[PDB]
Design an enzyme around this catalytic site. Structure first.
Site, PDB file in Angstrom:
ATOM      1  N   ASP A   8       0.845  -1.177   0.000  1.00 36.40           N
ATOM      2  CA  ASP A   8       0.000   0.000   0.000  1.00 36.40           C
ATOM      3  C   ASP A   8       0.897   1.249   0.000  1.00 36.40           C
ATOM      4  O   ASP A   8       2.081   1.159   0.349  1.00 36.40           O
ATOM      5  CB  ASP A   8      -0.884  -0.022   1.231  1.00 36.40           C
ATOM      6  CG  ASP A   8      -1.771   1.176   1.314  1.00 36.40           C
ATOM      7  OD1 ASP A   8      -2.188   1.673   0.244  1.00 36.40           O
ATOM      8  OD2 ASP A   8      -2.030   1.625   2.444  1.00 36.40           O
ATOM      9  N   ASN A 219      -9.191  -1.170   3.007  1.00 36.60           N
ATOM     10  CA  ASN A 219      -9.045  -1.617   1.628  1.00 36.60           C
ATOM     11  C   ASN A 219      -7.784  -2.480   1.393  1.00 36.60           C
ATOM     12  O   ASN A 219      -7.533  -2.926   0.265  1.00 36.60           O
ATOM     13  CB  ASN A 219      -9.061  -0.421   0.658  1.00 36.60           C
ATOM     14  CG  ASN A 219      -7.946   0.583   0.932  1.00 36.60           C
ATOM     15  OD1 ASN A 219      -7.394   0.627   2.026  1.00 36.60           O
ATOM     16  ND2 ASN A 219      -7.626   1.407  -0.068  1.00 36.60           N
TER      17      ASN A 219
HETATM   18 MG   LIG Z   1      -3.484   3.388   3.304  1.00 34.95          MG
END
Ligand SMILES: [Mg+2]
Length: 266
Positions: A8, A219
């Site tokens: 990420d 997410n």
């Molecule tokens: Mg993040």
């Protein structure tokens, strides 16, 4: 036995100032390459915004943007899944009618869209998550092809609005995923970062046993559950830590590169 490393960006690879240890990274990257270890940037942000972080080596990396619907590798488009105009128009009508407090942004192939009337301060907030940001007087009909939408909402209404979305007639096509504090990405159902990595693993003929992955957000949860070597950042919330097998230092202590140098040092 790591063959792909996926991270990420915001809150993870990137520090709180939105930057990272460029020098340390490029030296790590040289190492990964000479070992044939693949490096994947996996983010809700659009590809165009992700490449800017790697000005001098982006063409050597694989990018998963939009949480999954858009994948680029070696500076070439591997997958691009667009939402159906009819579905977009319908979830928009629903949010405008039922949650007038949510600010709606459309994430298109080349630019983003907001409705005219949105406060300058919001415009200033979002404009970072988009190459170009255009203001329109209405979303009906729609402007471009769209990978996802984003709602800016009070973090405390986030769960409620996501459930409302999941319960709506567009349910089989569109789903919300928390992509940050006060944000919901409405993605094509099933096209999450876990799905994206599966596609890449399947294509490179590896398994999740060779996957190392870093995240700090909702997410990131499918991706983390997928990866055998799954790392939640020290700064991630409890639920995201619950999805990881290992904990890294915080994004403000180069938690990602630290783990990678540790692995390499192994
Ligand atoms: Mg993040």
């Amino acid at each position: 036995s790591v063959k792909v490393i996926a991270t990420d960006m915001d809150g993870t690879f990137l520090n709180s100032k939105g930057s990272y240890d460029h020098n340390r990274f490029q030296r790590i990257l040289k190492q990964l390459q000479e070992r044939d270890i693949r490096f994947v940037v996996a983010s809700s942000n659009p590809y165009r915004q992700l490449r800017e972080h790697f000005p001098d080596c982006h063409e050597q990396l694989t990018f998963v943007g939009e949480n999954g619907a858009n994948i680029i590798s070696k500076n070439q488009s591997l997958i691009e899944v667009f939402q159906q105009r009819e579905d977009i128009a319908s979830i928009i009508y629903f949010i405008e009618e039922k949650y007038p407090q949510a600010v709606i942004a459309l994430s298109g192939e080349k630019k983003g869209y907001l409705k005219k009337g949105v406060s300058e301060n919001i415009v200033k907030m979002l404009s970072p998550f988009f190459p170009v940001l255009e203001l329109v007087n209405s979303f009906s009909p729609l402007p471009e092809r769209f990978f996802k939408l984003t709602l800016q909402v009070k973090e405390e209404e986030s769960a409620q609005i996501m459930k409302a979305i999941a319960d709506y007639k567009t349910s089989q096509r569109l789903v919300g995923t928390a992509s940050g504090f006060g944000y919901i990405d409405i993605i094509t159902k099933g096209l999450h970062k876990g799905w994206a990595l599966q596609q890449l693993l399947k294509r490179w003929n590896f398994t999740s046993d060779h996957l190392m992955a870093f995240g700090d957000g909702g997410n990131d949860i499918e991706m983390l559950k997928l990866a055998k070597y799954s790392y939640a950042m020290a700064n991630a919330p409890k639920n995201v830590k619950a999805a990881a097998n290992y904990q890294a230092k915080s994004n403000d202590e180069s938690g990602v590169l630290d783990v990678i140098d540790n692995y390499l040092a192994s």
